[PDB]
């Protein structure tokens, strides 16, 4: 018999006054962090949906946020051209990272969490030292806005994606390009991420398509379709707490879930009233966090038995 999860809405979290841009579960699984165009970052209880606190400081909208390995720090990417490192406990800004000449769009800590990688509209990828806040390297990674940046599991690699239609893998230590995985220019690559085991790369293009690439071989293994995505840089995820699924937001206001192997859509989550720009999968539970744009502004938490 075949398996299909049965995610069902547990909570709806309201509070942001503008479209939500990104949601991320703390590695320890107790928190859900959310960023919004309202220039705020809010902290919520992953299991009770209970609002915890608001963290402010950016002068403009935030496009992305990311947790440190110990769930103690948070880094944010904003249109004010800076990234800010925050102490979640106190909610205060520890460092403001300055260098980008345009909107900072994406960010991530490396597994060690002593480094931060950022992607900007200025077309560069920058690597920052967490303790000092100094910029160690600036990579002329692309010829158009950088949509995503992510470290592989041992932190030796960085994967970037861009509107220039490319996906490049970089050597963290040297900052040199190890490979241009997606070579065609156009369609815009709106999102990239390494698989939990660091062997694959999940990439989304603005042609309603998600693809699983075998990094070492440089070849496409799986394609996932059926959802809508031609306008926004939507976050996509690997779900491995139960059945191995591919999770993603969509421009038709729903959350799509695919069987990773068969590539078949196994469930579509309804409830949001606007584009689901971001989705996140709990690190230990079969829980999904989803967030929507302007006509919704809410974050929904879903749970299944798998």
């Amino acid at each position: 018999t075949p398996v299909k999860p049965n995610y069902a809405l547990m909570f709806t979290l309201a509070g942001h006054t503008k479209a939500v841009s990104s949601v991320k579960f703390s590695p320890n699984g107790e928190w859900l962090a959310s960023s919004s165009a309202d220039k705020l970052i809010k902290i919520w209880g992953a299991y009770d949906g209970k609002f915890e606190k608001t963290i402010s400081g950016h002068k403009l909208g935030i496009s992305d946020v990311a947790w440190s390995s110990d769930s103690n720090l948070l880094v944010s990417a904003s249109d004010d051209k800076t990234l800010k490192i925050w102490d979640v406990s106190s909610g205060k800004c520890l460092k403001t990272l300055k260098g980008h000449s345009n909107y900072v769009f994406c960010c991530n800590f490396n597994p060690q969490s002593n480094l931060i990688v950022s992607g900007s509209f200025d077309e560069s990828v920058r690597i920052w030292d967490v303790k000092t806040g100094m910029c160690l390297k600036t990579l002329p990674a692309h010829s158009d806005p950088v949509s995503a940046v992510h470290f592989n599991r041992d932190g030796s690699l960085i994967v970037s994606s861009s509107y220039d239609g490319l996906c490049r893998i970089w050597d963290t230590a040297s900052g040199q390009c190890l490979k241009t995985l997606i070579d065609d220019d156009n369609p815009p690559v709106s999102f990239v991420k390494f698989s939990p085991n660091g062997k694959y790369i999940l990439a989304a293009t603005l042609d309603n398509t998600l693809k699983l690439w075998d990094y070492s071989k440089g070849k496409c293994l799986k394609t996932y379709t059926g959802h809508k995505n031609e306008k926004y840089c939507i976050f996509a995820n690997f779900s491995v707490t139960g059945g191995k699924w591919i999770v993603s937001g969509s421009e038709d206001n729903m959350v799509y879930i695919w069987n990773l192997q068969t590539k078949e859509i196994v469930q579509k989550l309804q409830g949001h009233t606007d584009v689901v720009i971001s989705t996140a999968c709990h690190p230990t539970e079969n829980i999904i966090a989803s967030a929507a744009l302007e006509n919704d502004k809410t974050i929904k938490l879903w749970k299944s038995d798998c």
Binding site: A37, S63, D79, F121
Partner: peptide, 5 residues
């Protein structure tokens, strides 16, 4: 601005 096109 990830929220805008």
């Amino acid at each position: 601005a990830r929220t805008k096109q």
